[PDB]
Copies of this chain bind each other. A is one copy, B any other.
Amino acid sequence: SHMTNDTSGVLTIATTHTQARYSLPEVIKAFRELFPEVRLELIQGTPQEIATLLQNGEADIGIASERLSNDPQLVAFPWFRWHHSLLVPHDHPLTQISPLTLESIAKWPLITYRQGITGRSRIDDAFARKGLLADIVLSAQDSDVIKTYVALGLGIGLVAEQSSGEQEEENLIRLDTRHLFDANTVWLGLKRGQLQRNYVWRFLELCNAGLSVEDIKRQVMES
């Protein structure tokens, strides 16, 4: 097979709860087969921590939807795009509405992410187009807390579509609302101007077949 079979080292990834649970596992699987002798470590944190770990060299790759593509000291690459969905009890009024609207949604107590995490600004901007503030009864740092309080009757949720919405957890159900909110990007961030072991560049290629190692590198070293 491959030439990367005795490649060794330690790849440290810093990431959020969202990608840790809903996107990375697949990629990690692929990477462990490809690089069996490379130790992989993860640190979970907020976007702001992820950016600091990057600028200190405490992590090799940072993965999040916020603050990586706007840091002078990093360089970030698109991984995939995603949208929020509505998470509601299986028989909630909103399930007998249609077309779903922002007006519609703004009527219910809302359970979603704190500011500056998992696309929260997209939710806010969506309502702002209609002059509205959302009724936020729970500010979560993760989709799992959201599911708990939707199940518990406290309000409806806005979550990342990939948080599976919640397909398994029965009595809950995801309603697609692509038409109401703008898209998000998950970013792959590296420290600007910093050389990296081979398995680091290879790792970006595994998340996004659309990236080329040459172009990524040429672009980290621009400065």
Contact = CB atoms under 8 A, between A and B. Distances in A.
Contacts of A167: 168-169
A209 interface: no
A202 to B, nearest CB: 19
A42 B139 contact: yes
Interface of chain A, helix or strand or loop or mixed? mixed
B114 A43 contact: yes
Contacts of A43: 114, 138-139
B139 A142 contact: no
A127 B38 CA distance: 26
A73 B148 CA distance: 31
A78 interface: no
Contacts of A152: 25, 28-29
Contacts of A145: 17, 20-21, 44
A44 B148 contact: no
Contacts of A114: 43-45
Contacts of A124: none
A42 B137 contact: yes
Interface residues of A, number: 30
Nearest to A43: B139
A205 to B, nearest CB: 21
A141 interface: yes
Interface of A: 17, 20-21, 25, 28-29, 39-45, 114, 136-142, 144-145, 148-149, 152, 154, 167-169
23 contacts: A17-B142, A17-B144, A20-B140, A20-B148, A20-B149, A21-B145, A21-B148, A25-B148, A25-B149, A25-B152, A28-B152, A29-B152, A41-B137, A41-B138, A43-B138, A44-B138, A44-B140, A45-B114, A45-B141, A141-B141, A142-B142, A167-B168, A167-B169
- Which 9 residue pairs spanning A and B have beta carbons closest together? A42-B138, A144-B144, A44-B141, A20-B145, A43-B139, A44-B140, A21-B148, A41-B137, A25-B152
